[PDB]
Amino acid sequence: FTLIELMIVIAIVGILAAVALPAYQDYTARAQVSEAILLAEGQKSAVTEYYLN
Amino acid sequence: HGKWPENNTSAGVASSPTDIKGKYVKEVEVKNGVVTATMLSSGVNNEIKGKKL
Ligand SMILES: *[C@@H]1O[C@H](C)[C@@H](NC(C)=O)[C@H](O[C@H]2O[C@H](CO)[C@H](O)[C@H](O)[C@H]2O)[C@H]1NC(C)=O
């Protein structure tokens, strides 16, 4: 008898595929969301520039 | 003449103060020697708009 050793595999086979993937496509999103933010960084002072002058 | 000029005409400058003006300045009046200058409106956000020096 070994099957419970196979059972535990197929328990490992059914993986979670952690929410630490989709919370980190949401924070990979935070990466390229930031890529949008880093654009905004340029306009921060330029928009400001119009706003002040 | 031995006293401060009341006003522009006496000072010998543009009788209308508003004619004397700046890129961001509204007018310049003589007031018994004291030279008051009024600022324009927008051109800055800042709390100067129409204010006096
Ligand atoms: C210029 O500032 C002097 C101090 C004024 N003179 C006096 C005595 O207050 C002048 O005003 C005299 O001249 C004007 C000329 O039209 C007028 O005749 C007034 O009656 C005077 O007092 C001031 N000049 C002006 C044009 O206000």
Swiss-Prot record, chain A:
Residues making up the signal peptide according to the UniProt record: none
Q: Which post-translational modifications are recorded for this protein? A: The O-linked glycan identified as Gal-GlcNAc disaccharide in PubMed:7477282 and PubMed:10048019 is now identified as either a hexosyl-diacetamidotrideoxyhexoside (DATDHex) by mass spectrometry in PubMed:15249686, or alpha-D-galactopyranosyl-(1->3)-2,4-diacetamido-2,4-dideoxy-beta-D-glucopyranoside (DADDGlc) by X-ray diffraction in PubMed:16949362. It is not clear whether there is a chemical difference in the glycosylation of the two derivatives of strain MS11 used in these experiments, or not.
Which classification does the entry list for the species?
Answer: Bacteria, Pseudomonadati, Pseudomonadota, Betaproteobacteria, Neisseriales
Deletion consequences: Deletion mutants show a complete absence of observable pili.
- What function does this protein fulfil? Major component of the type IV pilus (T4P) that plays a role in cellular adherence, microcolony formation, resistance to neutrophil mediated killing, twitching motility as well as transformation. Mediates the attachment and the formation of bacterial microcolonies on host epithelial cells. Mechanistically, pili retractation induces host NF-kappa-B activation in infected cells, which is temporally associated with the formation of gonococcal microcolonies.
Q: Quaternary arrangement and interactors, per the entry?
A: The pili are polar flexible filaments of about 5.4 nanometers diameter and 2.5 micrometers average length; they consist of only a single polypeptide chain arranged in a helical configuration of five subunits per turn in the assembled pilus.
Q: Where are the N-methylphenylalanine residues found in this chain?
A: 1
Residue ranges of the TM segments? 1-21
Q: Where in the cell is it found?
A: Fimbrium; Membrane
Q: Give the protein family.
A: Belongs to the N-Me-Phe pilin family.
Q: What is this protein called?
A: Type IV major pilin protein PilE1
Stretch of the intact protein here: 8 to 60 of 165
